[PDB]
A paper describes a structure:
WbbB, a lipopolysaccharide O-antigen synthesis enzyme from Raoultella terrigena, contains an N-terminal glycosyltransferase domain with a highly modified architecture that adds a terminal β-Kdo (3-deoxy-d-manno-oct-2-ulosonic acid) residue to the O-antigen saccharide, with retention of stereochemistry. WbbB’s two C-terminal GT domains produce a polymer with a [4)-α-Rhap-(1→3)-β-GlcpNAc-(1→] repeat unit, while the N-terminal domain of the protein contains a GT99 retaining β-Kdo transferase, referred to here as WbbBGT99. Kdo addition blocks further polymerization while creating the epitope recognized by the carbohydrate-binding module of the cognate ABC transporter, allowing export prior to ligation to lipid A-core in the periplasm. The evidence presented above strongly argues that WbbBGT99 is a retaining glycosyltransferase that uses a double-displacement mechanism analogous to that used by retaining glycoside hydrolases.
Capturing WbbBGT99 in complex with the CMP-β-Kdo donor is complicated by its instability. The density corresponding to the Kdo group is significantly weaker than that for the nucleotide but refinement of the structure using both CMP and CMP-β-Kdo results in 25% occupancy of CMP-β-Kdo in the active site, with atomic displacement parameters (ADPs; B-factors) similar to surrounding residues. In WbbBGT99, the CMP-β-Kdo density is not consistent with this conformation, with Kdo instead refining to the higher-energy skew-boat (OS3) conformation. The C1 carboxylate group forms hydrogen bonds with both the backbone and side chain amide of the invariant Gln228 from the QxxxD motif. In addition, O4 forms hydrogen bonds with Arg163, as well as the phosphate-linking oxygen, while O5 and O7 form a hydrogen bond but are otherwise facing the solvent channel. The exocyclic O8 hydroxyl group hydrogen bonds to both Glu158 and Asn179. In this conformation, Asn232(=Asp) packs against the edge of the carboxylate and the exposed ring of Kdo, but interacts only with aliphatic groups and makes no hydrogen bonds. Notably, both polar atoms are within van der Waals contact distance of the anomeric carbon (the closer is 3.8 Å away) and can be brought closer (to within 2.8 Å) by rotation around the Cβ–Cγ bond. The anomeric carbon is therefore completely buried in this conformation, precluding (absent a major reorganization of the active site) the acceptor approaching this atom as required for an SNi reaction.
Author numbering:
A (entry chain A), B (entry chain A): 1 to 379, 390 to 404
The structure:
Amino acid sequence: GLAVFLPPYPFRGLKAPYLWMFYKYLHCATDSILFITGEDYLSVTDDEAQRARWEFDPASMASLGYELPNAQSMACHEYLTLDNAFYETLLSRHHHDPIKSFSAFLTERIPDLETELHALLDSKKGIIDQIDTFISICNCPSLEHVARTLGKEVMHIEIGPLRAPMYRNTAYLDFAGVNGGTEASARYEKCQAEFDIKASLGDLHNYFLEVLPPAEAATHSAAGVVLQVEDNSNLIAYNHDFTNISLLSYVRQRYEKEDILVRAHPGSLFRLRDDVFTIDDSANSLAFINQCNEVFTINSSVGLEAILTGKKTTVLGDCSYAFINELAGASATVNAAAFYLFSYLVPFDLVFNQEYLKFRLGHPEEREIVGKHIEFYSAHSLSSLINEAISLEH
Amino acid sequence: GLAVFLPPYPFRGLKAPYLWMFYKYLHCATDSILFITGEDYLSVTDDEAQRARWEFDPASMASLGYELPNAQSMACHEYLTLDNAFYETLLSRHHHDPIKSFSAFLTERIPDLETELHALLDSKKGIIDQIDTFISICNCPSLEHVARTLGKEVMHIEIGPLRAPMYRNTAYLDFAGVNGGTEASARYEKCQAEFDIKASLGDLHNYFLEVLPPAEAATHSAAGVVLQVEDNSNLIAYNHDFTNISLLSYVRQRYEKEDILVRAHPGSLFRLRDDVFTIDDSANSLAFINQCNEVFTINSSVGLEAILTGKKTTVLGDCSYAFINELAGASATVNAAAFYLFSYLVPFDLVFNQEYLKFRLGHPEEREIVGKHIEFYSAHSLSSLINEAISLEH
Ligand SMILES: Nc1ccn([C@@H]2O[C@H](COP(=O)(O)O[C@@]3(C(=O)O)C[C@@H](O)[C@@H](O)[C@@H]([C@H](O)CO)O3)[C@@H](O)[C@H]2O)c(=O)n1
Ligand SMILES: Nc1ccn([C@@H]2O[C@H](COP(=O)(O)O[C@@]3(C(=O)O)C[C@@H](O)[C@@H](O)[C@@H]([C@H](O)CO)O3)[C@@H](O)[C@H]2O)c(=O)n1
């Protein structure tokens, strides 16, 4: 079966922080799977002092394609629960800074964590052997080390950078790292010679757009700045020490403040005062981007959007799509982006689909991977698969 | 004379960033002083695309006690100007992050900076010998190293944590460090035995309050969180890696979100969304504090305010006043705070007064220092000086 790691540790101050993926796996489940999680994920469903959370909102539920589990839905599966005192103990080893503790959880081994994991995984006999792969929603070297000892692979799975309703839903699936430490550039390097895509970057973008585009390229700001959620894993671990405020100061070295348009992240706790910069108020990030000559970001999904619409983009942090931007030729960039969208990214629902997971677990050729994504999307060389997908969809 | 260091480097994206202190020294000047600064501080006065800055606002001018210089006012003094390409070069040595470059400027030696300083300081003969002390508005180990080579002391001078109109204006003056690396705790340790202050912490606070207090201790939040300006020197260098967002997550480990009251810094670029926490909207930080049972801060001036009003205070960064909070007994805390307010802090105008600077340059006894501050404030042992000041002022 699948071993799904949904750590309960409330680093950002929220209990059961990955509850939406717990509900998505639980909704889509054909076989039993092993949850490695925390008591919180199980009791939130009945605790009334938190039904104002967004994972219980029918608009988020419909958008991610899940319904709330019931007693029978829970009982198909096995559960292993981590405890809190390791969390308390972890905080005190990092000066009671929960954000530094999160950083450590994302980027270093924690021996106590590993022992707890090793203990739960043979808490009952037969558990270990039934495990076909681990799935983790974030990088976790404690788990990756545990997985090596046992001979298990680790699929790192997260919602993608293109999302409904603006786009088809996409998801990440990467054996090395999600967001940080990814293998997207190395997968492309192995197959770049098979890519001869007869489309522009804009045509790639249109294939994935599910809406009429805004499209008012008239009136502009020389520079657009993308802000991110301040304590997102991207901004804690893979940011190269850039923050929202040093990103703005980066931009202000280069442009006067009258030439800068700044878009706060809708999900951030913080908004911009209407004092110094021109604050964007577009209904969506695509219409924000189309108002800017160039775009500056740490590692937000919106940077990919800026690259697919042809904009000069500066990417200051590590991310899965950076390598696309770093290519020289215009054609080289198109081919790298097409591999990215059609083969690195996965149609969102497949990463919760157990047979597609078995497929990826056999490490098939890039042609097979691209042919299975396009089949899902549309419901013979690799280049002609994509070229025709583009040509027919249009 | 005085050698005043007002670095022109626009780390926070603002030219002539320390312009208000340049205008305060220029207004108060009796003798010629040597400015070590940048071309920007001189041309801003005539550049019309920046008279919207707050240093030209008659309300800031009246509050800090200065008027704008004229041609004659400038001509009393000598000027030495730093150049920009060292700044450009510094940025590229820190991944073009201006906030990391600022951190380095505040906490490490920069050899190129030192050579530039050494060059300007004997650009003309006789400059060096006329220098009686350097004054710097922030810590700068390049300058401190330069000062040691030449045999000069460095006064670190900044606006204090108590400010008009809520309080008498105060200023910092410290030979080792301002904000970071201060000597306040070590000055107190040398004289603690001379301190027997017959007053409460509240009476200390009242001596400095210049307004009727708000005073509505009825209705409360278990926890108040103080946010700071995100790219302030305090939050770049002396913060122990705490940020506004990890401070909130620190508080959320300890209290539910319904028990937390959060005050953004009025000067920050960012305000809080009205979604998750109760956002304070008091007219001033004192009325915010009086609504909270305990107060959490990195190293904001408001933490001192919380300590003078008797509140349980948590201080997560380095600051000049921390040592007061770390004391055990109630009496011990009063005495440490009285030394802090009456002898560590300086009445704001004296730190621009050239004869008072000569006084401090002779390193007089704490009794002399306290007697000169109280004389300024009111216009014989150390304990009876303060006890009577408190008793008469009331
Ligand atoms: N200034 C911004 C930033 C984002 N968005 C919108 O918010 C979405 C997410 O972009 P993000 O910038 O990539 O958001 C974060 C981030 O802040 O870095 C937080 C959260 O989405 C989380 O999903 C992580 C990664 O998905 C972690 O795996 O990424 C975009 O696709 C876009 O719809 C926006 O409109 N404006
Ligand atoms: N949440 C806050 C923070 C501050 N203040 C008010 O703003 C003032 C400054 O407090 P600060 O928190 O100490 O402000 C900063 C800071 O953000 O740390 C920025 C700026 O004042 C600068 O003066 C530095 C030091 O003065 C640097 O020497 O300190 C307080 O005295 C108080 O009037 C407030 O009302 N609410």
